[PDB]
């Protein structure tokens, strides 16, 4: 039961859903894990004297 | 036949996704929830 048979039936189109999902989560994991590393290893800016 | 079911599905799904993203971003930026920092 589908309306996008060229997108949900055909292997090339069906694959595109997984491709888009995996690319979105890959980019999000990229950005999130970078900023996590950067903020955990970087020291706090030294307290003002 | 007016209003293809496919069209309504696309429009509703895109509107729901856009609204979920917008509301999440408004709520996170408000700092009432503090981007989850608490």
């Amino acid at each position: 039961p589908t309306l996008f048979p060229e997108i949900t039936n055909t292997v090339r189109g069906r694959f595109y859903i997984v491709a888009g999902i995996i690319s979105v989560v890959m980019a999000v994991a990229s950005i999130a894990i970078f900023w996590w590393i950067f903020y955990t290893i970087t020291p706090a800016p030294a307290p003002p004297l | 036949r007016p209003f293809e079911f496919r069209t309504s599905v696309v429009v509703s799904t895109l509107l729901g996704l856009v609204m979920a993203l917008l509301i999440h971003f408004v709520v996170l930026s408000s700092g009432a929830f503090n981007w989850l920092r608490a």
Binding site: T2, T8, R14, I17, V18, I21 | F33, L36, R37, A38
Partner: peptide, 26 residues
């Protein structure tokens, strides 16, 4: 309760994804 809720919403995202992708991948 924020870590609880973020974990909750990510797992609901994942389970939703398994469900409807299971249908699409049927």
């Amino acid at each position: 309760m924020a870590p609880f809720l973020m974990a909750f919403f990510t797992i609901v995202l994942i389970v939703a994804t398994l469900y409807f992708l299971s249908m699409i991948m049927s």
